A paper describes a structure:
TRPML1 regulates lysosomal calcium signaling, lipid trafficking, and autophagy-related processes. Loss-of-function TRPML1 mutants cause a neurodegenerative disorder, Mucolipidosis type IV (MLIV). TRPML1 forms a classic tetramer: each subunit contains six transmembrane helices (S1–S6), two pore helices (PH1 and PH2) and a ~30 kD lumenal/extracellular domain. The extensions of S1–S3 (labeled as IS1–IS3), including several basic amino acids, present an unique feature that presumably binds to PtdIns(3,5)P2 in the membrane.
In order to compare the binding sites of PtdIns(3,5)P2 and PtdIns(4,5)P2, we determined the structure of PtdIns(4,5)P2 bound TRPML1 at 3.6 Å resolution. Supporting our proposed inositide binding site, PtdIns(4,5)P2 binds to the same area of TRPML1 as PtdIns(3,5)P2. However, the 3′ phosphate group of PtdIns(3,5)P2 is closer to Y355 than the 4′ phosphate group in the PtdIns(4,5)P2-bound structure. This difference may cause the charge of the tyrosine ring in the PtdIns(4,5)P2-bound structure to be less negative than in the PtdIns(3,5)P2-bound structure, preventing the strong π-cation interaction with R403. From these observations we hypothesize that one potential structural mechanism behind the differential regulation of TRPML1 by PtdIns(4,5)P2 and PtdIns(3,5)P2 may lie in the 3′ phosphate supporting the formation of a π-cation interaction between Y355 and R403. Previous studies showed that PtdIns(4,5)P2 can decrease the ion efflux of TRPML1 by competing with PtdIns(3,5)P2 binding to the channel. This is consistent with our structural observation that PtdIns(3,5)P2 and PtdIns(4,5)P2 bind the same area. PtdIns(4,5)P2 may serve as an agonist blocker on the cell surface, preventing the other lipid agonist from entering the lipid-binding site, therefore keeping the channel inactive. In this manner endogenous TRPML1 is kept relatively inactive at the surface of the cell due to an abundance of PtdIns(4,5)P2.
Residue numbers in the entry:
A (entry chain D), B (entry chain C), C (entry chain B), D (entry chain A): 38 to 201, 216 to 526
Amino acid sequence: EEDLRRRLKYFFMSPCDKFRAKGRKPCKLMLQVVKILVVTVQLILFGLSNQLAVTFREENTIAFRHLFLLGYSDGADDTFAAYTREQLYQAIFHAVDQYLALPDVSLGRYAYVRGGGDPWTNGSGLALCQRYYHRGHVDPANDTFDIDPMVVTDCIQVDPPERPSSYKNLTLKFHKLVNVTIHFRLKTINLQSLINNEIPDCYTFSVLITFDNKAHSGRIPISLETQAHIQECKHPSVFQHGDNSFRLLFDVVVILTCSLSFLLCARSLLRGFLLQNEFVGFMWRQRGRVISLWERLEFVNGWYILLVTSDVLTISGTIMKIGIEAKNLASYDVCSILLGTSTLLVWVGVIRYLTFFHNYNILIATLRVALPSVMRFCCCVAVIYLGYCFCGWIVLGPYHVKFRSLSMVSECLFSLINGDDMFVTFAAMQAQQGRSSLVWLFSQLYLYSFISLFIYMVLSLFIALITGAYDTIKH
Amino acid sequence: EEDLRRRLKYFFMSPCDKFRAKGRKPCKLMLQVVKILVVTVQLILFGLSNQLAVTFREENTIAFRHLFLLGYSDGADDTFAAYTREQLYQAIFHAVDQYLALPDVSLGRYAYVRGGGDPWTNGSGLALCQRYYHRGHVDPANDTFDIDPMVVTDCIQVDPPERPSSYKNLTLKFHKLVNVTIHFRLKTINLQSLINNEIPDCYTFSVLITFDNKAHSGRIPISLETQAHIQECKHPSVFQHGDNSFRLLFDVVVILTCSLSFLLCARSLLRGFLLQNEFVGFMWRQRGRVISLWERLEFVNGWYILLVTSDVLTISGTIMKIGIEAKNLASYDVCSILLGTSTLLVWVGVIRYLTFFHNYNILIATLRVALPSVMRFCCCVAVIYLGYCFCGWIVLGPYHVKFRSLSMVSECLFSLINGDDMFVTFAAMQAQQGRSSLVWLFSQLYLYSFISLFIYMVLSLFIALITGAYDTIKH
Amino acid sequence: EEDLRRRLKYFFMSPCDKFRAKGRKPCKLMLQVVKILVVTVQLILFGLSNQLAVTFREENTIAFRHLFLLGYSDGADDTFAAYTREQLYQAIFHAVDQYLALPDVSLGRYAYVRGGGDPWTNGSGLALCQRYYHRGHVDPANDTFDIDPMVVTDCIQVDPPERPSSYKNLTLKFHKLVNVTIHFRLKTINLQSLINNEIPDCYTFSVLITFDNKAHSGRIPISLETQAHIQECKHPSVFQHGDNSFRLLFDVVVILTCSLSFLLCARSLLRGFLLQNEFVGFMWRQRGRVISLWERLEFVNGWYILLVTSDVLTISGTIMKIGIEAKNLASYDVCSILLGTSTLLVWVGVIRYLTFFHNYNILIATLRVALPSVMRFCCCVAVIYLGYCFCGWIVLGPYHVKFRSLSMVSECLFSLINGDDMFVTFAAMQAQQGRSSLVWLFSQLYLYSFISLFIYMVLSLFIALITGAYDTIKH
Amino acid sequence: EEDLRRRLKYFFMSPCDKFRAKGRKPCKLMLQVVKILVVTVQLILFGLSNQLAVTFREENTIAFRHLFLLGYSDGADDTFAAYTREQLYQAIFHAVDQYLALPDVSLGRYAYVRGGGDPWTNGSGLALCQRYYHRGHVDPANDTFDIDPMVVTDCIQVDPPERPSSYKNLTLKFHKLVNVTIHFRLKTINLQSLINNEIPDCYTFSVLITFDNKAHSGRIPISLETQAHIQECKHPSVFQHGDNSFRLLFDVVVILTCSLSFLLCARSLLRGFLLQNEFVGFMWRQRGRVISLWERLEFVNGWYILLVTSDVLTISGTIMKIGIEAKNLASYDVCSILLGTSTLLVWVGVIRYLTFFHNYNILIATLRVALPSVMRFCCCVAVIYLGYCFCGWIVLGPYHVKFRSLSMVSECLFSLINGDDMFVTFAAMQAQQGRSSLVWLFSQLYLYSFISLFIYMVLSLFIALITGAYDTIKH
Ligand SMILES: CCCCCCCC(=O)OC[C@H](COP(=O)(O)O[C@@H]1[C@H](O)[C@H](O)[C@@H](OP(=O)(O)O)[C@H](OP(=O)(O)O)[C@H]1O)OC(=O)CCCCCCC
Ligand SMILES: CCCCCCCC(=O)OC[C@H](COP(=O)(O)O[C@@H]1[C@H](O)[C@H](O)[C@@H](OP(=O)(O)O)[C@H](OP(=O)(O)O)[C@H]1O)OC(=O)CCCCCCC
Ligand SMILES: CCCCCCCC(=O)OC[C@H](COP(=O)(O)O[C@@H]1[C@H](O)[C@H](O)[C@@H](OP(=O)(O)O)[C@H](OP(=O)(O)O)[C@H]1O)OC(=O)CCCCCCC
């Protein structure tokens, strides 16, 4: 520390002592405070426009399941099937007879498409199709079965009449069938213009009823899918952009203020790297050996590496959100994560504002001392925790529904050590008590030892590691 | 401490040492003990009269949903709707045909109103009305839509016959409709006079059936509302006030005894302010600087500021409860909070009676040392906790019902760190596993990191702060 | 300690040092070990005979609800009612037509009673009765109502024919009715003689169908009750007492061995009282003042006061269980508590056998040091906990079902601080969000402050009191 | 320690110091690392072939309950019964009429058996049978009942016609019947050859419909059972073993590599026993007395005793899994436990690899110091915990369903101290509030004292034992 006491001990510095040494107003500091009030308000004005366009989308799918499926009651979306050979005829014919008489029984003013796509012809609106094996003759107890898997697509085409036969002659070959699908499209007008007070959207659905039979087990599940394709509709109206000028000028400010904060925060990371040369350069190997890949990262502080990354995640989400004016992108799964994960990192930066206080620093710096010791112990438990996942998946696998796959076993074993759906899993074991009573005896040894290891001892380590790292900050 | 050792060290004083110095019987202390046995008994005699008048009110609404709605089974109050154009005709006509034949199928002896209100005429009892746009012609794929929002109120009036046509000619214009409401009123006699043994009340309901269609999505929810308007009914009977003299003389005692305790407790706050002049006045800036806005509030003790406020909340609730004899106020939401929040503060004052013991003081004064350190750490977590609310609301928003609004996200994320409805949220993510499988991967990173931060570390700080503030009271 | 070092320091004594001083085999100690293996085996042989006689009793009530009630589906035992005036005629007539044709549609071989009781005549088996007000004429909007409460009992009597009219002329006066009940009895033969291999029991039920209308709110709940009256049936068979001699000789051993242990344990309490005279008698007020109501109870040890009481509870339950041979007592609610609470106290006496070990004593004597400090703090919380019960019962009372009475509020507030039915209570508040939106704002302040007081601080005191009383046993 | 400092202090040795003394590459150590990647991949390739063969098995049983049972809706598998004498005729006849017309209404191409088993004749496919008492005449109120238990098996035989009467004359004797069963078998072809691309399996079911009446209580539960008998089906096809050569050569590697690791790990246990002779042999009773059955087990380390046992459990599960090629064994309950429990012990051996680090050893060796003290305290609680099981089973036994047997009481009392199904048990007590109101008062003393003993104190001992054993590893 020969020459640069004025400069190297100005880098390591509390921001409240900036006024005493030289003094300049915090135009560097309060720029990040603006980012709190600019990014959050962007998300609320976008999140309330996404909430409106889903509660209309998911309430046409419910209205499509009652008009197009035979005997649909609420709550049954997985147990709804067809078990006889005459219920599958009555489910296909009811889905078409309600399509050929749609604007006389349904309310909402839907209209047909006269489609010209790939699973349609030149003048069709409905296309029910079959898939089955091209050559097959199976018979149990006379075991000459021949399988050549090649799907045969025998589509049936019918058009909708509006202003005032060849599908009833349908054969399915039930010992050969794979699945029967139904394709049609409907256009509607979103009449939710109370909040917009301007031109609303014009939607175009795509309903897919699937009579899937892949298990070949005498059970055909029936479902319904939609893909709400959204674009503008050609209006003869005028002056839409009187209210459109209140939302697009606000989104380019985020492109500015997060990138204007990307200029200043990254430059502070350049200034921290030039002072690495000034420090070890004049320390000309004086204390033997200086750099051991730990003294270089002292200049690199963990808060500027967070705001630089949070500016990249924000600027990659604002460009995608501009694709709502007229652009033909339909991907809200990517656009919402890039805005959502960035907003998670913007808010946790306020802890740095709470860091420079002498009474909050004790409550935070224990989470930097214990953060190695907690994460070290999490590797001694995630070896044990992966042990009970493979043992429960193959023994309690055929008999129970909760223990079926490792995406579901690791959710039912992790919710059971925190105290939820516990007696439901014990009471489900006793439905197989008389049925193969040795599995029930192993399911009592499995569900008593796993629950009394991660609650009574392993959960009690995480209490003792924080308290053991709380006495070492003031004693 | 020159002159007032007899007086300033009589203010700071344990109440059990009052007898030794001068000595007077505790007519100041035991007045608050009477307030325990006067306010609580007021609430139980009022709470058991409110319980009787609601279990009659909410069991006529259930009886109105079965008589007036077509196909109403229990448990369905949100999934009950109408999806075709003929089920809405059969739901309006069944609600009127059971109104024009009400005293021949229903038990309970209801009677009509012959109403003279604002949505009625001079001689009507039932008024079904429409609302629709005044000028509209929408059509998808021929996109000339014109909207001028102005509700048109085409009410239909019909009267009930009792002693031994123009509504069947109803058209709704389903591509233009907003909502269809139904207004009528019924009067009944509360025959629950077992506990009263005197004149009971006479009610007048107001049933509102709402065929609301605001989403314009092919789904019309059906509901029913009541506002039980309550006043007396003109009796030719005599001597009601033989049992009425057991409840109104007891309520003016609370007006006395809480205000007589407002005279003595506030005067003790005046006496604590005059001794502020006697203390710092004769300390004529002797130790440099005395008052720094912390030494003034030493005279202000936190228990007399609580009982003064609890007397204002009580006296503002006793005046409102007098409006049950003959007054025409109908507001129980304000009257019950003013009594309920006051009773919460009366009971916690008993801790002051448990404060002056040498074995309970250790168990309470740790909650005054740790109360800063817990509340400081709650500000370092409510910044993180508001981070995960915005990230979960826009990503897991369209796909799930629990994560729909911040009034519901902050209830499902807070119940998940205490161990409830945990596996229900994990099993609801896997219904969208094949459907857009990148959201499911983010919902595993979101629901494993949020749950292992506020249970394994942050919940383990609150254990270490109490223990760290429990060793500093006896070591 | 002058004279009785041989005797007073033989009273205070570990039982493993009994062999070294004088020496006698533990016929005093191992008598209590026999009580472990005699009382527990009595309960299992009695508990498995009570389990068999209830699963037959509660599976005739389910079979009676399907044969005698119109439209009874499972799961609905509180929502089952009758809302129109014609459904109450069809529910009474179906309960009688299935009684007059019972042995032709029902399986089980039930038989009639030809009853001679108090609500019957000389030759009747079925008695449907009415109760209504003797003088009443109520009318809303012409408010001259007169009430004279006196029940009029107009019973209708009909007899069952078996070997090959005046009830159809029934009028109920629905604006005057109170309730309509139905009384009959059936006799059956318990054919579950697989485990008995001797004469089984012969039952006589009593079915009570109640069309109760006390609310007068247009809703009549329908229910069914049974009282299975049990005695012997007059058999011409012989040699029942070949298997009866395996269960009554085993129950008089408990009358002996618990009372033979009442002779020795109470005599040890007499011997502890005579040595109180020998101790303070020769201490002739030597150290000033000796007895201060704490030194007398040093001789009284807390384990012999437990086994004496556990012998009284056992001997009062064995006498009652003898009333199953031929005695006409029917009270299993008293007999099972006297056996159950006694068995709870027999098992916790084994801790005394684990007390005399130098490695288990540390784990138990912390529960005698902390047991004052935990119970002192439980009085500082049960004052706060009773505060939130009265505030939640009157504000969240009319709007919600869980917060209806203090027998239910104190179960829903206590299960919410341990982590169960938490999000169910938050999601039930938002069904009244638009309906009177100030109650919903108070229900967020009520259900966030109560849950973050008894989990984050008050639950963290009980961890700090045990740890603070665990360092004071070895440091 | 005279002669063998080179040898006895080479046994006690960290494996990272093996290179410094003599030096050889870890072919002993990394063999166990191969066992991680060989046993786990064996379980995933076997677990995904068991998952496919169960989701076909349990989706034919659902398809059999809708085709063969009258009025079967989903969710009712215990409440489905028959209560009148005409519903049992309509349930037997519907199960046969859908069997004699099975290949005309059902999809899946099932075929009959023409069975030649023990409950069949020479040319039958369906066998409905009766069981009843051979001599019985019971009558209540004329109490001459005679019972001679001997089952009479009156089977009725009928054959299925395919290419284009004596069962309708059936009498059941309902006052004498025991149960009515139905036996038939069906063969189907598993058409799930997408993942196999070769010859699939050929199944043969066995459906058992049971009209069991053992309670004789007017309720006959109806159920359905299957035993999917699996073997090959005689194919005229060729070249199945092109894909079969990818799974059987991988399973004999586990037979090698776990037994090749059984040669080296057991030899290390032989070498630890020869050095017991070298240690105490040259210590010729020098320090008085050496071996006290604690110094012998110092050579026996707890990790080699675990891998030897885990090799026996693995080699006993690989031999059983070979019985899937052509062997006629059908026992997956034994084969999955021998693989599952072995895989649990393979994964926990990785803790030994995390043991030899100076920062993970503190987090693990506390679980060897506290493991006595936790297990000692678990014996002082499992005496109390067995006390509340017998007290709750006989008092809350007849009235409630959750407290019915000790296999269910010990699951509902253990899930209640961890915070699950808590308010469900409190709300179930209040359904018997008016009915025998002294049991309800005892159920509040029972469910408030048991829950505030094992959460507020006993759960707080396990936190204080870990923290008390964490300060004794670094202070
Ligand atoms: C005369 C008009 C009517 C007044 C009738 C008065 C009848 C009588 O005998 O006087 C008592 C009076 C004390 O009452 P005083 O008016 O001062 O009131 C004090 C005041 O209420 C404090 O807040 C009380 O403390 P705490 O909240 O309880 O902790 C305290 O209660 P307690 O100590 O009373 O328990 C009181 O001292 O004496 C004196 O004034 C001091 C000596 C000067 C002599 C004054 C002689 C009157
Ligand atoms: C004679 C009538 C029948 C009595 C048959 C008696 C047969 C015989 O051999 O006498 C033993 C008797 C001791 O029994 P004793 O009647 O005093 O009974 C004592 C009493 O039961 C204590 O409560 C026991 O303590 P603990 O709850 O176990 O902790 C203790 O048990 P234990 O120490 O026995 O284990 C007993 O000392 O001796 C003496 O009286 C003292 C010497 C005076 C000589 C008396 C000679 C009889
Ligand atoms: C010749 C027959 C085939 C044998 C081929 C042998 C090829 C060769 O180079 O010999 C090595 C052999 C050591 O192997 P050795 O048979 O004694 O086996 C030891 C044994 O397996 C221990 O349990 C191992 O400890 P750990 O579980 O790992 O902790 C240890 O492993 P490692 O130390 O090996 O890693 C072994 O020492 O040397 C000696 O015998 C001692 C010197 C005497 C000279 C002996 C010269 C052969």
